[PDB]
Design a protein around this ligand. Structure first.
Ligand SMILES: C[C@H]1O[C@H](O[C@H]2[C@H](O)[C@@H](O)[C@@H](O[C@H]3[C@H](O)[C@@H](O)[C@H](O)O[C@@H]3CO)O[C@@H]2CO)[C@H](O)[C@@H](O)[C@@H]1N[C@H]1C=C(CO)[C@@H](O[C@H]2O[C@H](CO)[C@@H](O[C@H]3O[C@H](C)[C@@H](N[C@H]4C=C(CO)[C@@H](O[C@H]5O[C@H](CO)[C@@H](O[C@H]6O[C@H](C)[C@@H](N[C@H]7C=C(CO)[C@@H](O)[C@H](O)[C@H]7O)[C@H](O)[C@H]6O)[C@H](O)[C@H]5O)[C@H](O)[C@H]4O)[C@H](O)[C@H]3O)[C@H](O)[C@H]2O)[C@H](O)[C@H]1O
Ligand SMILES: [Ca+2]
Ligand SMILES: [Ca+2]
Ligand SMILES: [Ca+2]
Ligand SMILES: [Ca+2]
Ligand code: NA
Length: 483
């Protein structure tokens, strides 16, 4: 069966402590529609109860210790999470955990540290003389004590921070100490993009490297995870990420599929990341997200023949995770660049019914977003579910592409004799509707095919040579399959 990932959260999920129970209750539904793996949000204790998990305080607290004024995380308790994972696994759905290793947030106390300021546009350049600051770097875990790990964090485990508690000023501070320097290799944007936010972990420090590998193995084992989503990969030493993934795989004996978030609209830089990590993990296809967004926002003027230009999926199809939108590109968020609603079903047909890429469905697109703008994403599950059914049951076999018009483009799948009645013909258009003659395979000659989306009511008959004349409405999608 075709694999399909689902990101199971949106930025504005409520702080009601019931998210793990929601997931548990949705397991049957997710398996029924064709989801084969779920990416869950960071499940460890953040600097406050309402943190989404990207300001992680204690990686060993999965919602069971009294820290930061709460036992549960935003999403629920550890036992609730283990019950959700149990329900998914009983329905043959895998679970990938989000891993936030670039920084730590919410230190228990400050420490005195010697530091220099650096140029925000070129972090290799020092711009001040050294001086003393008070940085938030002492992590003691008073609610956990030494349960699971007795490692405590201090300033010397970090490379820098962006807040001095003594003068109350925000600058990028690089710490002074033995062999201190920004890590390499990382993105060369801003000269060196190791520093992002909070207290930056030093992956040159051998105890830190060793402890982080130990945590990785503990986390995969405690929750029985099947893979990972690596946060902020452009900001973490590439050879460390390569080796950390290898160490967890070696210790568990599992495949541990891994996808890294390397946020850059440039395939060449993404290819460098793949090379530097020995092709041992996939990346999200950022360039394809931006091509889909561009097509959705040009009112029909985009040249649809160019949708695959510059994308990771056109060059490295087995190492790409394709997506339409996520918790950062949704309205009001940090990487806001939402695919407009009218085009969203066409974008989902493009990533779910083509042979290359491992597609991701976004929670926010299925169930709607609950942010406070006048442009939230509406719930589109009724439009996406028929496309997921097309992937689950019909998108198999040889593919033929028809990117030969500036508005109307399409592709077909001949089907596979081992999946009964498989085969499909998809057409999308960013402009007026029309038709296209496409080949679906002589083995499907004389069959009656119909649009599974319900957008067109007229069925199409495949001629004796394996060709059909397919139609599509304006600004729409049609996916024809065996009636
Ligand atoms: C989002 C994306 O970002 C990056 O992408 C960039 C990209 O790489 C770049 O290229 C560019 O992109 C271009 C593109 O290339 C172009 O082509 C295209 O066209 O345009 C784009 C541009 O749009 O730009 C991109 C954007 O910059 C990155 O590459 C991606 O990977 C990334 N995506 C992923 C990564 C993420 C990060 O993990 C996710 O980000 C999300 O979450 C972030 C974290 O929440 C969020 O960050 C923002 O918000 C943060 C809050 C902020 N932190 C600062 C704030 C601080 C304090 O608030 C500060 O904290 C320090 O100081 C505190 C003291 O004030 C101290 O706390 C102590 O005191 C307090 C009081 C104590 N708490 C007490 C209170 C209580 C509560 O009642 C009690 O509970 C408690 O008991 C009590 O004690 C505490 O205990 C004390 O410790 C702290 O300790 C101290 O650390 C901090 O240091 C500050 O940094 C961030 O800076 C801000 O950025 C992001 O916005 C979210 O998006 C993302 O989701 C991932 O997918
Ligand atoms: Ca370093
Ligand atoms: Ca870093
Ligand atoms: Ca067009
Ligand atoms: Ca057939
Ligand atoms: Na670092």
């Amino acid at each position: 069966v075709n694999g399909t990932l689902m990101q199971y959260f949106e930025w504005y999920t409520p702080n009601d402590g019931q998210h793990w129970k929601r997931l548990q209750n949705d397991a049957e539904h997710l398996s029924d529609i064709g989801i084969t793996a779920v990416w869950i949000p960071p499940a460890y204790k953040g600097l406050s109860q309402s943190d989404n998990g990207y300001g992680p305080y204690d990686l060993y607290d999965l919602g069971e210790f009294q820290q930061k004024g709460t036992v549960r995380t935003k999403y629920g308790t550890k036992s609730e999470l283990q019950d959700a994972i149990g329900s998914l696994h009983s329905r043959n759905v895998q679970v990938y955990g989000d891993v936030v290793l670039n920084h730590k947030a919410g230190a228990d106390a400050t420490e005195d540290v010697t530091a220099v300021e650096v140029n925000p546009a070129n972090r290799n350049q020092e711009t001040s003389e050294e001086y003393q600051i008070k940085a938030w770097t002492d992590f003691r875990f008073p609610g956990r004590g030494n349960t699971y790990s007795d490692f405590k964090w201090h300033w010397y485990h970090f490379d820098g921070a962006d807040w001095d508690e003594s003068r109350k000023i925000s600058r990028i501070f690089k710490f002074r100490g033995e062999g201190k320097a920004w890590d390499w290799e990382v993105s060369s944007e801003n000269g060196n993009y190791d520093y992002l936010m909070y207290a930056d972990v030093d992956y040159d420090h051998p105890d830190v490297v060793a402890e982080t590998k130990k945590w990785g193995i503990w986390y995969a084992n405690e929750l029985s995870l099947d893979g990972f989503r690596i946060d902020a990969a452009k900001h973490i030493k590439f050879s460390f990420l390569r080796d950390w993934v290898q160490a967890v795989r070696q210790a568990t004996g599992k495949e541990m599929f891994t996808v890294a978030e390397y946020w850059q609209n440039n395939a060449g830089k993404l290819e460098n990341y793949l090379n530097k990590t020995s092709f041992n993990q996939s990346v999200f296809d950022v360039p394809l997200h931006f091509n889909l967004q561009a097509a959705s926002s040009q009112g029909g003027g985009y040249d649809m023949r160019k949708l695959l230009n510059g994308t990771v999926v056109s060059k490295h199809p087995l190492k790409s995770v394709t997506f339409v939108d996520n918790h950062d590109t949704q309205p009001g968020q940090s990487l806001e660049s939402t695919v407009q609603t009218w085009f969203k079903p066409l974008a989902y047909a493009f990533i779910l019914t083509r042979e290359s890429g491992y597609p991701q469905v976004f929670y926010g697109d299925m169930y709607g977003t609950k942010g406070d703008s006048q442009r939230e994403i509406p719930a589109l599950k009724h439009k996406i579910e028929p496309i997921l059914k097309a992937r689950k049951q019909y998108a198999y076999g040889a593919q033929h592409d028809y990117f030969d018009h500036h508005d109307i483009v399409g592709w077909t799948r001949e089907g596979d004799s081992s999946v009964a009645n498989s085969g499909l013909a998809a057409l999308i258009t960013d402009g007026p509707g029309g038709a296209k003659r496409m080949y679906v395979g002589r083995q499907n000659a004389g069959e009656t095919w119909h649009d599974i989306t319900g957008n067109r009511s007229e069925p199409v008959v495949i001629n004796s040579e394996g060709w059909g004349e397919f139609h599509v409405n304006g600004g729409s999608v049609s996916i024809y399959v065996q009636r």
